[PDB]
Amino acid sequence: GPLGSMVTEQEVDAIGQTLVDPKQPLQARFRALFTLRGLGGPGAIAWISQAFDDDSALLKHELAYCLGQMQDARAIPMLVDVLQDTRQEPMVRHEAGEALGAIGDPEVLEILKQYSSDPVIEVAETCQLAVRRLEWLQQHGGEPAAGPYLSVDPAPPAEERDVGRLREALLDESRPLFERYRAMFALRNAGGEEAALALAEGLHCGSALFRHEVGYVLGQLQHEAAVPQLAAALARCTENPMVRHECAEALGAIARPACLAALQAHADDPERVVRESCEVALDMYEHETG
Numbered sequence: 001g002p003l004g005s006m007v008t009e010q011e012v013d014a015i016g017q018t019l020v021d022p023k024q025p026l027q028a029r030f031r032a033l034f035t036l037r038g039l040g041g042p043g044a045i046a047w048i049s050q051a052f053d054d055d056s057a058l059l060k061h062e063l064a065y066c067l068g069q070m071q072d073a074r075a076i077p078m079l080v081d082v083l084q085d086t087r088q089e090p091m092v093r094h095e096a097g098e099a100l101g102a103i104g105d106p107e108v109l110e111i112l113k114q115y116s117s118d119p120v121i122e123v124a125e126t127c128q129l130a131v132r133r134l135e136w137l138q139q140h141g142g143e144p145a146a147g148p149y150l151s152v153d154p155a156p157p158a159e160e161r162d163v164g165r166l167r168e169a170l171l172d173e174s175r176p177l178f179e180r181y182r183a184m185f186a187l188r189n190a191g192g193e194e195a196a197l198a199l200a201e202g203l204h205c206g207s208a209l210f211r212h213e214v215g216y217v218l219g220q221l222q223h224e225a226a227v228p229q230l231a232a233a234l235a236r237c238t239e240n241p242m243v244r245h246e247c248a249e250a251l252g253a254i255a256r257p258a259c260l261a262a263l264q265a266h267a268d269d270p271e272r273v274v275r276e277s278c279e280v281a282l283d284m285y286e287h288e289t290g
């Protein structure tokens with residue numbers, strides 16, 4: 001009947017209040033955020049957009065990730081404002097640039113080309129990738145065929161199916177970043193232990209953006225052969241906090257007892273982004289058990 005779209009907007013505003021309340025536990029605000037991401041619409045976009053006020057770089061970058069995945073052009077102005085806001089952490093600005101790419105609307109090409117020259121290397125790289133993704137979409141007439149993951153990725157998977165040839169492409173520092181990302185998503189889609197370990201070798205090369213992406217796709221693939229390397233990266237205090245956070249999230253997704261021990265080990269880490277990732281990951285495991 002017609003009460004459906006009243007009930008949903010009530011639930012949206014309620015969840016929204018939970019998200020923007022800085023006194024709610026972080027795991028509760030993540031839960032609100034991902035529910036809004038699923039529900040979608042203008043109310044949802046506004047409440048997510050309102051949370052960019054927050055102190056947590058972890059939370060703010062998830063906001064931007066969610067707006068990207070929502071693929072709703074209504075988010076574009078807010079994501080531009082985040083991308084341009086030089087006071088935002090690199091991780092946050094990177095995520096807003098990627099999100100502009102994910103929405104796939106060419107209206108944003110000119111800004112993405114501009115920010116391909118941003119002084120913050122994560123941002124520059126992210127926007128280079130997003131310009132190539134927009135160019136790909138334009139040449140192919142839309143998103144690639146749906147693969148095994150429902151995510152909207154920063155690059156379409158490479159056509160090559162041989163894992164060994166994909167590994168070579170991934171680890172080649174002379175190839176363009178976009179081509180390397182394509183081989184990375186093809187590895188993830190190939191699956192199995194050989195591809196998991198080939199991916200995990202990428203935790204020792206490229207830029208910090210590249211390594212973080214490796215972390216994310218290892219968390220999506222969820223293959224346990226990668227745990228030791230994900231836990232070792234998490235443990236490396238010299239590693240970039242954005243990479244260590246992504247590794248922690250991956251460990252969170254896999255959620256095997258050994259992942260859970262590594263996350264507890266780092267729950268008092270000095271890097272706020274790393275502590276909060278471990279918190280949220282452990283809290284989700286506790287929820288599930290309950």
Ligand SMILES: [O-][O-]
Pocket residue numbers: 061091094095212242243245246
């Ligand atoms: O982006 O971590």
Ligand SMILES: [Fe+3]
Pocket residue numbers: 094095212
């Ligand atoms: Fe990211």
Ligand SMILES: [Fe+3]
Pocket residue numbers: 061245246
């Ligand atoms: Fe991240």
